[PDB]
């Protein structure tokens, strides 16, 4: 059978606002050469170099991500996506290509602290069949584990100074207990926080 794989050396990029650049490793984990195609998307101030290059079997290379211009809020983080695609060489035939995408988190130096210091501050409510989180911090709170009434909820980021509503499975009638972990800057599942919903 056929095998594919792209590894980025981190699962997120914390980009300090106004910084010259950052680097991230990209690894072709396959036994055939590919083309590595890298694109930035909104949730072109950020430039990826090289945007396209060959990467031989089991080889690793690095991209530079650089901010030239652009304007971002300084009271809040901004979110972009770095996408890294491994294009393989060219009755049903199908060819696949993995497009591996990670958050590019634009962080004002003007922001005090880091996410793990404010992860406890999430507050929770059920309105209209949905579990709603409120994030009073200036950081994206990248939830990586979320449970309500002891039932797993697929997670999603809560944007800065804003909210996110999660769809609930059936049977969480009068459930009040929410548990969550965010993903820290290095890509690790952080501490478990637990809290009752309010009205």
């Amino acid at each position: 059978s056929k095998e594919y794989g792209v590894t980025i050396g981190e699962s997120r990029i914390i980009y300090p606002l106004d910084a010259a650049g950052v680097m991230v490793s990209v690894k072709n984990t396959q036994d055939y050469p590919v083309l590595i195609q890298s694109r930035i998307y909104d949730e072109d101030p950020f430039v990826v170099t090289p945007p396209l290059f060959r990467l031989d079997a089991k080889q690793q290379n690095s991209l530079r991500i650089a901010q030239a211009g652009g304007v971002f809020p300084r009271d809040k983080e901004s979110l972009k996506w770095l996408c890294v695609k491994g294009i393989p060489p060219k009755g049903v035939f199908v060819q696949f290509a993995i497009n591996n995408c990670i958050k590019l988190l634009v962080r004002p130096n003007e922001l005090k602290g880091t996410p793990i210091q404010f992860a406890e501050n999430l507050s929770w409510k059920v309105d209209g069949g949905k579990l709603i989180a409120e994030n009073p911090s200036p950081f994206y709170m990248n939830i990586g584990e979320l449970t309500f009434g002891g039932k797993s909820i697929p997670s999603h980021y809560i944007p800065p100074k804003s909210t996110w509503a999660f769809d609930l499975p059936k049977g969480l009638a009068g459930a009040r207990n929410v548990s969550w972990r965010i993903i820290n800057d290095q890509g690790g599942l952080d501490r478990l926080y637990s809290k009752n919903v309010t009205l």
């Binding site: 594919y4 695609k85 009755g91 035939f93 199908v94 696949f96 497009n99 939830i143 990586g144």
Partner: protein, 146 residues
Amino acid sequence: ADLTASFTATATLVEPARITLTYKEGAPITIMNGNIDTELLVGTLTLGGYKTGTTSTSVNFTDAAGDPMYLTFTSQDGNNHQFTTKVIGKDSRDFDISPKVNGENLVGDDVVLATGSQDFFVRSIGSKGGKLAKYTDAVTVTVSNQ
């Protein structure tokens, strides 16, 4: 004499984002009236490498046709015959789940993918045209890591 000192040693550990994909070709396909049989397991996809907590809605299989919810296969001959497929799987409770396909989910709620890897099956639907006579697709699997 014993003299002492102390320091807190520190280390930073990092989690790269690894995405893998295995495609296992299904049986060859049989023309019956110029229909292929439905629910033919065209192929089995195994997505792996992702972090536990990765969700079904963060996975998007796209192709050039762009038909929401369906991948489109086309003949390599010049005649442009076409059929559509869906990409579907099962959760831990054995309920029907799907990734996004051209940006939309066919079936089920957003779920957390199985730990380690998750199988998806490419299953034939039909061809809104009619008479099918190598059929090809080029599919991008985009994973938006949490």
